[PDB]
């Protein structure tokens, strides 16, 4: 029923992130939580605004778009550090990937 949510002006003042340290193996996605508070004095769960950037571009995958998912997936092994950037606040998430198969 609802569609197209126009905005006024990005006024990011403060943000809160609650990452989780979990291990993934044999194709597994980790579900994280991300919440942002507008300077206008409101609170909303937005994962599309938060920018996700990880070292390994191969395992650096995120499904942030649905709403407040923010989940991520890994393809290769190693310790890909998940760096989150949003306004004046940033987050961090650790994922354990042990890709044994090609």
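^ Assign residues to that structure.
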């Amino acid at each position: 029923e609802n569609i197209d949510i126009t905005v006024s002006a990005a006024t990011l003042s403060s943000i809160s992130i609650s990452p989780i340290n979990t291990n993934i193996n044999t194709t597994v996605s980790k579900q994280f939580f991300a919440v942002g508070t507008y300077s206008d004095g409101t609170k909303a769960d937005l994962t599309s605004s938060v920018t996700w950037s990880s070292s390994n571009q191969s395992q650096a995958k995120v499904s942030n778009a649905s709403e407040t998912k923010g989940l991520v997936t890994g393809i290769a092994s190693g310790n890909p550090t998940i760096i989150a950037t949003y306004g004046s606040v940033s987050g961090n998430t650790i994922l354990t990937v042990n890709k044994t198969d090609t």
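Residues 1-102 form a domain with the Immunoglobulin-like fold (CATH 2.60.40.1080).
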